[PDB]
Amino acid sequence: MFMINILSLIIPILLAVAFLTLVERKVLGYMQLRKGPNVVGPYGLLQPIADALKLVTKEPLRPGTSSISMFIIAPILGLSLALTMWVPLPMPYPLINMNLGVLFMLAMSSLAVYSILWSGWASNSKYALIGALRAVAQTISYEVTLAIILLSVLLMNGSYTLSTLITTQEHIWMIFTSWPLAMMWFISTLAETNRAPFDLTEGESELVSGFNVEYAAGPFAMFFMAEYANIIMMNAFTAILFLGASHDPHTPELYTINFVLKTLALTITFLWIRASYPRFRYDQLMHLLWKSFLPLTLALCMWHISLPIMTASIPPQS
Amino acid sequence: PFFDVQKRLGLDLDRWMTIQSAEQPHKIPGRCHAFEKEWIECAHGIGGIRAEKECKIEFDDFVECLLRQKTMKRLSAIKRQRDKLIKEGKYTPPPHHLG
Amino acid sequence: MNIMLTLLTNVTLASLLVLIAFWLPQLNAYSEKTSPYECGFDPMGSARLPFSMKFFLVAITFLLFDLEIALLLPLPWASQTNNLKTMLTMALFLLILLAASLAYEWTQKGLEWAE
Amino acid sequence: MPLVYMNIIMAFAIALAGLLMYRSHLMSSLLCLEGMMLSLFIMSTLIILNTHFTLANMMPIILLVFAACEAALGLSLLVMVSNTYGTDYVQNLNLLQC
Amino acid sequence: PTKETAHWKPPPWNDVDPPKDTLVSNLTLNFGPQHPAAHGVLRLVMELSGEMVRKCDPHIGLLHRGTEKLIEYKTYLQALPYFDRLDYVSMMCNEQAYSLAVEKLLNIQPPPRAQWIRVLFGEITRLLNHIMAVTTHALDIGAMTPFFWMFEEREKMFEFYERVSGARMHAAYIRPGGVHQDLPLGLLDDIYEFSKNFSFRIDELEEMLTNNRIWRNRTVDIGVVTAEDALNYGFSGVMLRGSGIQWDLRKT
Amino acid sequence: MWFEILPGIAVMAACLFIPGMATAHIHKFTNGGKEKRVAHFSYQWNLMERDRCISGVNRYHVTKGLENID
Amino acid sequence: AGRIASFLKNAWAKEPVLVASFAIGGLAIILPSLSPYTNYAIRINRATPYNYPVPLRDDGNMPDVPSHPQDPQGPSLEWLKNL
Amino acid sequence: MTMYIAFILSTIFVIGFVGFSSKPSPIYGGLGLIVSGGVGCGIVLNFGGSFLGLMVFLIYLGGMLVVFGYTTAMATEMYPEVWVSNKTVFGAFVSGLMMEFCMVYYALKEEEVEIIFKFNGLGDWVIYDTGDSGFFSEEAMGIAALYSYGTWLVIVTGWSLLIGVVVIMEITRGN
Amino acid sequence: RGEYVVAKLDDLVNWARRSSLWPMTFGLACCAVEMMHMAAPRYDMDRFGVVFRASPRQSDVMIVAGTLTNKMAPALRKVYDQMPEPRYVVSMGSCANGGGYYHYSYSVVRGCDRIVPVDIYVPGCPPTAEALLYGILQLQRKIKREKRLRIWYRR
Amino acid sequence: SMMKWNRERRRLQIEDFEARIALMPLFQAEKDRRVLQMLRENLEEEAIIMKDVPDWKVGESVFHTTRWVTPMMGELYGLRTNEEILSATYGFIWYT
Ligand SMILES: COC1=C(OC)C(=O)C(C/C=C(\C)CC/C=C(/C)CC/C=C(/C)CC/C=C(\C)CC/C=C(/C)CC/C=C(\C)CC/C=C(\C)CC/C=C(\C)CC/C=C(/C)CCC=C(C)C)=C(C)C1=O
Ligand code: SF4
C-alpha cells in the first residue's frame, strides 16, 4: 500500500493548494473590506474548481520565439520539486525517514531557480529576461541565510534527522530559544517564495510578471501550483522548526491536528503580511540581506554554536 | 616532502590522514587496516627501492584487499560456469540458494 | 525503491498535468499570435541581447559564500567530538573568516550592488 | 575494478576531450572543466566510502571547495573578456599574437 | 619573416590596443504603451545604463482628443462639460476654473451662496483627488489596502455628487454665473457625518504609510527637486509646496 | 463577518489533515499495529534483519517472546 | 572616554544591527573560555560509549580495573546523573 | 529487474556527460551536467554517501546556477545556439553513445575488457563490504572530523576563500 | 444519444468560463476611474470570480475604458490580437462604444468596434459602476448560453 | 529549559547505548556463525560446481596471508537468490 500512501500525500496537497487560491482571495478581501468570492457555490467554496477548469481549457499559447523543450520542462521542474519536497516532513510518522531530511529539503529548495531561469529565458521576452535574473538573484541570495539559520537552529537539535526535531522541542517551543533567528528565517522564507513584500519579480509596473509572462493556461498554472505549494510547505517547515507540538505515540492524530493548525496560522500570517506591506525595491531588497540580515545571522550562528558547549548541553547525536 | 618542517619543528600537519591505519575518529578501522599495518610495519627504515621487493607479498595482498580484482575475477569465473551448466541443465541449486 | 517510487510518482504526475495542459485545449493557430509582447508593444529587437549588468559581483560572491556554507555544514556532527575546545576555536575561525570576507566585500564596494 | 569505476573514469576522459578540444565557446569549455571535477568528485567519493577511509571522508568537500573557486574566477575572467570583446566566442580571442 | 609574418603588426608601446568598436549602450526601453500602471495610457522611452536612469522621454498624446480644437465650435454653455471630462479626478475644480474665467469676462459675480457651494464642493473634489493620488501611489508601490479603504469613502463622495448634480462623476454643476441649482435637503447633515468620520481613517492611512520602514525607504529622499529649479520648470501645486516655496493660490 | 473565511480554510484544514493520519495509520496498519521501526543507523538495520529472520514469515513487525523459545 | 562612548552611541543608533551582531559575536568567543562548564561538556562527550569497551586480559595486579561490570571500583559518572 | 540500477546510474551518468561535453548550446551542456550530477548523486548515495551526495546536490546545483547567471548575462547573443544547430554535435553525441556501449557489450561477454586498466563486467554489488556501523554514520563522522583532525585543512581553505574573494574583487574591479 | 453527454460537458465548461472571466483592465479615461470604483469595497467585482488584475496573456475579457485615440489604436490592436481565445471584449462608456463627446475629433477613432470586436456595449458617461457590473453580468449570461461542443457534435 | 532537557536526552542516549553494549556480544556471536554458514554452504556447493573445470583448485584463498579476513560480501551472497543480495546490499540505503 506504499503507493496508496504516496497518492494520499500528493492529492490532498493538491486540494490544499487549490483552496489556498480561495482562502487568499477571501482573506485579502476581508482585510481590505471586500466580501471575497462567495458566488461560486456556498461561500465561494466551488470557485477554485471553475478557475482550474478554465485554465485547463484555456488555450496554451506556444511562444513563437522560444524553444519548447524548456517551455515544457520548467513547469515540470517547478511543480514536481515542490511536491516531492513535501516527502520527508514529520507528520507524527513522516512518510520517508531520511536521515538528512532537513538538508534534503533545503537542497531541493534551491532547485526553484532551475525552473525560474528556464522560464525567464526560454519564453524570450524583455520582462521575462529581466525577471529571471532578478528573481534568481533574490532566491539564491536568501538561500544562504536560510542555510546558516537552519544550521544554527539544528545545532541544538542534535542531527539532520527531521523526525527527532519534535523530540528536540517537546517541552518548550523552539522559538523561545531562537526567536531572533526565526524572525529572520520566517522573513527569508517570505523572500524565497516571492511574496508581495519581497516578491520583486511581478512588480506590475516594470516587470509585470517577471517569469510567468508568456506562460499560459496549464504550464502557467503549474508555476502557480508550485508557488502556492511552497507557501504551505515552508510554513509547515517553520511550524515544526519553531512552533513545536505534543505527540503521544498512542494517539498520532493529536500532533497531526496541532501541526495543521500551526501551518494554517503561518499561512494566514503570510497573507496577513502581503495584504498590508508595500513592495521592496531590488536595491533595498538585496540591501536588506547583504547589509543587515547576513551579519546578524552570522553572529547568531556563532552564538548558537558556542552556547551548547558552554552550557554543557550538546544535543544527542543519535 | 621537499622541506619536511613537520618532523623538524615537531608537529603533524597532514600526516594524520595520509594512511588509513592512523587513529580514525572513534576507532573506525579502514577496510584494509590489517593489510596496510602489515605493509607499513614491513617496510620501515628499509628504503623504497629495497622495501618494494621484500614487502611485495604484503603489497599485493594489500592491493587485492583494496580492489578485490583477483577475488571478484574468481567469483566471475564461478558464476560463468554455474550459469553455463545450469543453462545446459545438470543440477539444481540447493534450497539454501532459493529459500 | 520506496524513495525512488515517490520520485517516479511525482514526475509522472507532473508530466500528466503538463500533457493535459498542452494537448487538451484547441487553438486556431493563426500567425499574428506569435508576435511577442511588451506592455502593449513587442520587445522590439531585444530580450536576447547580452545583458550589460553589475550585480554579477553579488552573483559570484553568492557562490564564494556557498563554498564556506558547505564547509561549515558538518557542524552538528562535529559538535559530538571529544576535543571540543579545538572544534570551538576552529569553527569560530570559520565564522570569523565568513565575517571578514563579508567586511572586505563591504568596505571595498563589493557587495555594494555595482552601479 | 567494476563498471562504476569504468563509467566515471570514461566520463572524465570525455570531459577531458570536451573541455580541451575546444569547439567555439569559452563558457561551455569551462562548463566542461567544472563537470570534470564533478566526475573526479564522484570517483574520489567511491573509494573513500568503499574502503572505510574515515578521515578521507572530508577530502571530497575539501576537493570541492577549491574547485568551484577555480570556476569562481573562470566565469569571472569570462566577463572581463566579454565586456570588451563582446562574446565568449574564442576565435576573435587573437589580439595577443606576437 | 617568411610570408604570413607580414600580417603581424607590432604591438603598441603602451601594451594597450586601440579601444575597439564602441559597445557603450543603455538598452532603450519603451516601457509601454498599454502598461496599465500609468492610469492606462503612457509611453516612456527610457535610456539607462542598466539601473540608474540616464535619460527618459515621455510620450503623451496616447489619449489625445481634439478638445482644444473642439471648444471653438460649441457655445460656452456647451463648452462646460469638456472641463468636467478634462481632469477627471478634480471635476468640480476644473468646472470652477472654467466658470470663473467665463463670468470674469462678463464682469459678473456669482451670488454668495453660489460661492460657498463652489468652495465646499471644490474642497470635496480636493479630498477625492488627493485620495486618488495617495492610494494609487501606494498601489504602485505595493500597498493594496489603503486603495480600497479610502475608495469606499470616495464612493461616499460620489453619492453626494450624484445627489447634487445628477451624475456621480461628471456633474456639469458649476456653471458661469453660479452653480446650476440648489442642494437637496439633508445633504449638509450627511456631509457633516462624513466629515466627522473621515479623520479617523485619514490618520489610519497615515499610520500604515507615514512611519512604515519600507514606505519611507522606497520613497524618502528619492528624486530631490531643488526649490530654485522647481519654479523655473513651471512646477506648481504640491510640487512647489513639497520643495519649500510658500505659495498657494487659495491664499495669495 | 470573518466567519465566511471559516469554510474556506476548513476544507483546507481537512486538505492538510489527510496526510497526517493516512501516513500514521498505514504504518500502524502495516507493522502489526506497531508504528514503523525507524532504522537511522546500521545497528537498527541489523536488529530489523534479525527480527525478520527470527519471525520466519519474512515480516519484521511479527514478534515472538519467550514462548517462542524453550 | 567621551569619544568612545559617543561612537558606541552613534553605532547603536546609525547601524544598530552592526553593533548587535558585533556584541553577540564578541560574547560568542569569550564566554566558552570563561564558562566553567565546557569541561563538563567534554565529560559528556567522553561518557558516551559509541563502541564496545573491549575488556583487558586478566593476569593479576590491576585493582583499578573492575573484575565485574557491577563492581564498585572503576570509572563512574554520578556527576552525569546529578547534572 | 532493478538489480542493475547501481550500474545504470553510472551509465546514464556517462551519456548525460557526453551531451554535456558534446559542445552544444551552453545551457544544453548545463542540462547534460545537471542530469549527470542528479544521477551521480544516486551513485554516491546508494554506496552509503548520503551526506556527500546531498552536499554535491546542494553546492553543485547552486554552482551551475551561477554559471547560468552569466550565460544569460555575458554569454548570450542575438541567435543563441541550439542543441541541433551545428552538424558536428550529433556526431560527437553518437560517438559518445557507441564507445561505452561496445565496451560494456564486451564486459558482458568477456568480463576482461582491456581498455586502459583492468576491469570486470560482473556488476558492482560485489565490491560492498559486510559489517556494521553501531549508532553512527561513518560518512558523517568522517566529515565531522574536519574540526578535530582537519587542523591544516580548514585553515588553508578559509585562507584561500578569503584570497578568493580578494581576487574576485580585484580582477572585476574595472579600475 | 450524444446531446445529453455533450451538453452536460459543455455546460460545465461554459459555467467554468463564465464564473472566472479575468478582465484586462485597460483604462484610458474617467471610465477607468469608474471601473476602479466598481472594484472598490462597495460593489466588489472580485466577489464574482472576476479578478480585475490580469496580464494580457492570462485574461479573458478586455474592458475598453475610455476614449480610444488614433495613437492608441495600434497598441490596443496588438493587445487584443495577442489575447488568447476565448476573448470577449466589452466597451464601456459612450466614447469607447462609438465616438463619444469627442466624436468629431481628428485623432479619436469613432468607436472601439472599428478597431476591435465588441461583445457587450456598456453605455454611460461614465457608466455608473453598477451599470458596468451589470454589463459584466450580461457577458456572464452570454457565456452561459454557449454551445461550443454542441455545434461541434452537430456540425 | 533546553539545557536541562538536552541533559536528560544525553542520559537517555547513554542508557540506550549501554543496552547496545549489553547486547552486542550476542549479535556478534550469531553473526560470525551466520557468515561462516554462508561461507561453508558456498564452499560445498562450489566444490560440486568446480569438479568439471580442469584447473580450479577448490576452496583456494587468493591471499598469501594465512590470517583470516572478513569475507568480501560478494562470495557471501553469491549464487544466492537475487532478492537476498539486493536486500543485503541496498536495504539500509533503500529503507525508509
Ligand atoms: C492611477 O494609477 C494606477 C496605476 O499606476 C499608475 C496602477 O498601476 C494601477 C494598476 C493596479 C491594479 C490593477 C490593482 C489590482 C487590484 C485588484 C483588486 C485586483 C487584484 C486582486 C487580488 C486579490 C490580488 C491577487 C494577486 C495575487 C494573490 C498574487 C499576484 C501575483 C501573481 C503571480 C498572480 C497572477 C495571476 C495568476 C497566476 C492567475 C491565477 C491562477 C490560478 C488561481 C490557478 C488555480 C489552479 C488550481 C486551483 C488548480 C487545482 C484545481 C483543482 C480543482 C484541484 C483538484 C484537482 C485535481 C487534479 C486533484 C491602477 C489601477 C491605477 O489606478
Ligand atoms: S464616455 Fe464619458 S466617462 Fe467615458 S471616457 Fe468618454 S467622456 Fe470619459
Residues 6+ apart with CB under 8 A from H102: none
Q: Quick check: E149 and A279 CB within 8 A? A: no
Closest CA in chain F for residue H131: F42
Q: Which amino acid is present at J31?
A: K
Q: Which three cell numbers stand for residue E214?
A: 519600507
Nearest CB partner across the interface for J17, out of G49, G77, G81 = G49
Is E236 at the interface with chain A, CB within 8 A? no
The Cα A84–Cα A100 span in angstroms is 15
Q: How far is the CA of I54 from the centre of ligand 1 (A)?
A: 6
CB-based burial, B54-89: b 16+ in 10 Å, e otherwise: ebeebbbbbebbbbbbebbbbbbebbebbeeeeeee
Q: Does H134 touch chain G if contact means CB atoms closer than 8 Å?
A: yes
Write out residues with Cβ below 6 Å of ligand 2: E 85; I 29-31, 66-67, 93-95, 100-101, 125-126
Residue D39 CA to residue D44 CA, distance in Å, equals 9
The CA dihedral of B39, B41, B46, B47, to the nearest 10 degrees, is 50
d(CA D85, CA A274): 45
Q: What is the DSSP string of G29-70?
A: HHHHHH-S-HHHHHHHHHH--SS--PPPPP-S---SS-SSTT
**I112 annotated to a ligand binding site:** no
Q: How many CA atoms lie within 13 A of H152 on its CB side?
A: 9
Q: Which of A73, A100, A155 to mutate to test the interface with H (most CBs of H within 10 A)?
A: A100
Kindly list the partner chains of chain D, i.e. chains with 3 or more CB atom pairs below 8 Å. B, C, E, H
User: Which residue, chain included where needed, has cell 545446459?
Assistant: B88
Contact A292/E at CB under 8 A? no
Minimal-distance CA residue of chain J relative to G43: J10
Chain Cα centroid distance, residue C90: 29
User: Counting atoms of ligand 2 from 1, which one is nearest the CA of I66?
Assistant: 5
Contact I136, E96 (CB under 8 A): no
Query: Which residues have any ligand 1 atom within 6 Å of their CB?
Result: A 11, 14-15, 18, 21, 24-25, 28, 48-49, 51-52, 55, 202, 212, 221, 224; E 36-39, 136, 139-140; I 25, 36, 39, 46, 51-53, 58
Contact J2, A314 (CB under 8 A): no
Shortest Cα distance, chain D CAs vs residue E31, angstroms: 26
Q: Do G52 and J24 touch (CB under 8 A)?
A: yes
CB atoms within 10 A of CB J28: 12
For residue G50, list chain H residues with Cβ-Cβ distance below 8 A: 134-136
Domains annotated on chain C, with CATH:
1-108 (1.20.58.1610)
Using DSSP's 3-state secondary structure scheme, residue E178 falls into: strand
Full DSSP string of B41-80? HHSSSS-HHHHHHHTSHHHHHHHHHHH-HHHHHHHHHHHH
| Burial classification of residue E248, based on how many CB atoms lie within 10 Å of its CB (0-12 exposed, 13-18 middle, 19 or more buried) | exposed
Query: Which residue has a Cα nearest atom 62 of ligand 1?
Result: E39
Integer Cα distance of C73 and H62 in angstroms: 15
Nearest to H36, CA basis, from D10, E179, A135: D10
Q: For residue F1, with 0-12 CB atoms within 10 Å meaning exposed, 13-18 middle and 19 or more buried, which class applies?
A: exposed
| Element holding A76 (H helix, E strand) | helix A68-84
Describe the crossing of helices D26-50 and D59-85 by its angle, rounded to 10 degrees.
180
| Ligand 1 atom with the shortest distance to the CA of A49 | 53
Q: Ligand 1: distance of its center to the CA of D82 in Å?
A: 40
- Whether residue D55 lies within 8 A of chain B, CB to CB, comes out as yes
**Nearest chain H alpha carbon to F39:** H135
> What is the experimental method?
cryo-EM
Tally of CB atoms within 10 A around A146: 23
Which residues are bridge partners to I108 per DSSP? I69
Relative orientation angle of helices E76-84 and E91-105, to the nearest 10 degrees:
150
The region, left, alpha or beta by phi > 0 then psi within -120 to 50, assigned to residue F32 is: left
Q: How far is CA H130 from CA H3, H116, H134, in A?
A: 18, 30, 13
Residue A292: burial class (beta carbons within 10 Å; 0-12, 13-18, 19+) = middle
C-alpha cell at position D29: 569549455
**How far apart are the C-alpha atoms of A77 and A75, rounded to whole Å?**
5
User: Does the CB of F3 have a partner CB in chain H at under 8 Å?
Assistant: no
Q: Which atom of ligand 2 is nearest to the CA of I92?
A: 4
CB contact under 8 A, D87 and C50: yes
User: CA-based angle D19:D22:D28, to the nearest 5?
Assistant: 60
Domain parsing of chain H, residue ranges:
5-173
- DSSP H helices, E165-232, are 187-209, 213-219, 227-232
Q: Is E174 helix (H, G, I), strand (E, B) or coil?
A: strand
CB contact under 8 A, G51 and H135: no
Helix runs in C24-83, H state only: 56-72, 75-78
- For J95, phi then psi, to 5°, come to -70, 145
Backbone angles phi, psi at C39, to 5 degrees: 40, 40
CB atoms within 10 A of CB D80: 14
Helices A175-192 and A217-242 pack at an angle, to 10 degrees, of 170
Q: Look at B76 and H111 and tell me if their CB atoms are within 8 Å.
A: yes
| Contact status, residue A158 vs residue A168, Cβ threshold 8 Å | yes
Rounded to 5 degrees, φ, ψ at I92 are -105, 145
Distance between CA atoms of E141 and A203, rounded to whole angstroms? 9
Grid coordinates given for A88:
520527508
Asked if A284 reaches chain E (Cβ–Cβ under 8 Å), the answer is yes
Which residues from J are below 8 Å from A when comparing CB atoms?
1-3, 5-7, 9-10, 12-13, 16, 96
Which residues lie across from E178 on neighbouring strands? E175
What is d(CA H158, CA C89) in angstroms, rounded to the nearest whole number?
Answer: 14
Q: Which of D12, G32, D78, I37 is nearest to H68 (CA)?
A: D78
**I31 annotated ligand binder:** yes
J54's grid cell: 580442469
Strands I88-92 and E53-55: unpaired
Peptide bond into I86 cis (omega under 30): yes
Closest approach of H21 to chain D, Cα-based (Å): 5
Is there a contact between H65 and A140 if contact means CB atoms under 8 Å apart?
yes
Q: Do C76 and A221 touch (CB under 8 A)?
A: no
Type of residue at B46:
I
How many Cβ pairs closer than 8 A exist between chain F and J?
Answer: 14
> How far from the centroid of its chain's Cα atoms is residue D48's Cα?
21
Torsion sign over Cα G16, G18, G23, G27: positive
I155 appears as a binding residue in the annotation: yes
Q: How far away, in angstroms, is E65 Cα from ligand 2 center?
A: 11
| CATH class of the domain comprising D3-92 | mainly alpha
CA–centroid distance, residue I21 to ligand 1 (Å): 12
Query: Which whole-number Å values give the CA distances from E242 to D25, E231, E237, in the listed order?
Result: 55, 12, 9
Q: How far apart are CA J59 and CA J42, in angstroms?
A: 10
> Chain A within 8 Å of I81 (Cβ-Cβ)?
no
How close, in Å, is residue J65 to chain C by CA atoms? Answer: 36
Binding partners of F (≥3 Cβ pairs within 8 A):
A, H, J
CA-to-CA dists, residue A138 to A135, A286, E52, E150, angstroms: 5, 7, 19, 33
Burial class for B42, CB neighbours closer than 10 Å (0-12, 13-18, 19+)? middle
- J71 vs H1, H125, H130: nearest CB: H130
CATH topology of domain H5-173: Four Helix Bundle (Hemerythrin (Met), subunit A) (1.20.120)
Which residue, among I87, A253, I132, C52, has the nearest Cα to E52 in the 3D structure?
A: C52
**Which residues on neighbouring strands pair with residue E46, listed in sequence order?**
E29
- Experimental resolution (Å): 3.4
Using CA atoms, how far residue E232 sits from D55, E225, E228, E235, H130, in Å, is 76, 11, 7, 7, 88
F49: closest CA of chain H, how far (Å): 12
Distance from the first to the final alpha carbon of chain A: 30
Per CB-CB distance under 8 Å, the chain G contacts of C92 are 28-29
Those of residues 14-53 in A touching chain F at CB distance below 8 A are 15-16, 18-20, 22-23, 26-27, 30, 35-36, 38, 42-45
Distances in whole angstroms, Cα of residue G65 to Cα of each of B27, D36, G48: 21, 55, 19
Nearest by CB to H135, which of J17, J74, J93? J17
H117 touches chain G (CB under 8 A): no
3-state secondary structure at position I6: helix
Q: Which of I56, I78, I85 sits opposite C35 (nearest CB)?
A: I78
